[PDB]
């Protein structure tokens, strides 16, 4: 195929159960870490689903892939409505950028909820975002891509692991550690997307990091999918060495607009 633009699909879609904002109040009367077991075998609208129940406040493992996000709650609609998200997501990005550079690639994927639990009218305002960072004015393009097969032992190996990101060094996977990320043939990713040939915005994180650590000509990544759409692509990072970090990542509410979402509980 021909050098093509590399399009990215939004990283996730939130589904916060009402049983969440109750558990909140129960606890608010006596910032917290939210946890969720990622379902990768079935997306919705072709993207990962971040599900937030009431028990989204405790780890059940040391078997299944748990994502750790963070929720900060505000006191008034003022402190909430008046707090520029861009800076928030930005800062959240830089933390993650750092964590990837010095530890493992998995440590870059995370989510953030800013919520205003108004007990007065028993309404709830929240907004979730899953950081996607890239060096300003950076662009990507696929040189070529091949169809990955999961019936491959190599894939079966990534599947068995309990991580979303990993490496291939000789045909055997391995923690995407800054060091291992310098002689690694390619990176593997349990994509949070099912759109044909369109990986999740969260891929940029893998790129931005993998690059700033082990600069290369091209970067081969293998997007693994429960679907039949798995594929391996040769990516090219153009124009990006800029020091400043640009981070997008907020989900769009049901109106299509980039605003929070309200879960009204007036009846109860």
């Amino acid at each position: 195929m021909m050098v093509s633009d590399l399009k990215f699909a939004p990283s996730f879609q939130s589904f916060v159960d009402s049983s969440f904002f109750h558990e909140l109040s129960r606890l608010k009367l006596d910032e917290k870490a939210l946890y969720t077991q990622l379902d990768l075998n079935q997306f919705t609208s072709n993207v990962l689903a971040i599900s937030l129940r009431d028990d989204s406040f405790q780890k059940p493992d040391n078997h299944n892939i748990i994502l750790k996000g963070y929720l900060l709650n505000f006191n008034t609609i003022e402190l909430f409505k008046n707090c520029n998200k861009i800076q928030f997501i930005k800062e959240k990005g830089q933390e993650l950028l750092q964590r990837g550079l010095e530890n493992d690639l998995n440590e870059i994927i995370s989510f953030y909820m800013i919520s205003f639990a108004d007990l007065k009218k028993y309404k709830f305002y929240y907004w979730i975002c899953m950081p996607s960072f890239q060096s300003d004015g950076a662009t990507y393009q696929i040189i070529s891509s091949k169809v990955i097969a999961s019936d491959s032992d190599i894939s079966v190996s990534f599947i068995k692991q309990n991580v979303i990101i990993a490496c291939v060094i000789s045909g055997v996977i391995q923690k995407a550690t800054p060091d291992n990320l310098k002689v690694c043939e390619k990176v593997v990713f349990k994509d949070f997307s099912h759109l044909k040939d369109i990986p999740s915005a969260v891929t940029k994180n893998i790129l931005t990091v993998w690059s700033k650590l082990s600069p290369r000509e091209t970067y081969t990544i293998c997007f693994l999918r429960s679907d039949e759409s798995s594929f391996e692509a040769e990516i090219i990072i153009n124009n990006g060495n800029n020091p400043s970090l640009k981070v997008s990542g907020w989900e769009k509410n049901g109106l299509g607009k980039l605003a929070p979402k309200s879960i009204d509980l007036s009846s109860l």
Partner: protein
């Protein structure tokens, strides 16, 4: 003494099917497998989200449906989802209860609510055969939300 012979096990052997044909139902926005049941997100009306739960009742030994309605209201530039508690008159408007009956009560831990389709006579309704029990059930019961859904 007739009564359902449907075992929770037998009920679970049949849930995947209910899930399969329930996918054909074009109103379905989503379908989560949950423990001993299925939880669908449905678009009942163009501003009414139907949170539907299918579980297995241990008292009467039949499959049951508890749900609850949500209205898609828009505050300003923000999308809101609000729980609805309608009168049985209001409720009987947006559904097709007919000979059936639903009672609005509270959830296990009295945190919120659910509409419960009374399940007592469920068995005298579906039939003798434990084979396809969940099919004949959902086929008929589902009609309470859409007369046109063909299973």
């Amino acid at each position: 003494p007739l009564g359902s012979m449907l075992t929770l096990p037998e009920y679970n052997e049949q849930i995947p099917n209910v899930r399969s044909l329930l996918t054909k139902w074009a109103k379905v926005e989503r379908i989560q497998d949950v423990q001993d049941g299925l939880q669908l997100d449905v678009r009942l009306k163009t501003d009414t989200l139907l949170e539907l739960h299918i579980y297995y009742d241990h008292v009467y030994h039949v499959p049951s449906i508890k749900f609850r309605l949500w209205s898609l209201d828009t505050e300003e530039d923000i999308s809101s989802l609000r729980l609805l508690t309608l009168s049985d008159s209001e409720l009987r408007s947006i559904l097709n209860l007919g000979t059936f009956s639903v009672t609005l009560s509270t959830d296990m831990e009295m945190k919120s609510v659910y509409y419960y389709i009374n399940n007592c006579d469920t068995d005298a309704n579906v039939g003798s055969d434990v084979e396809h029990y969940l099919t004949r059930w959902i086929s008929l019961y589902i009609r309470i939300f859409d007369l046109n859904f063909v299973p």
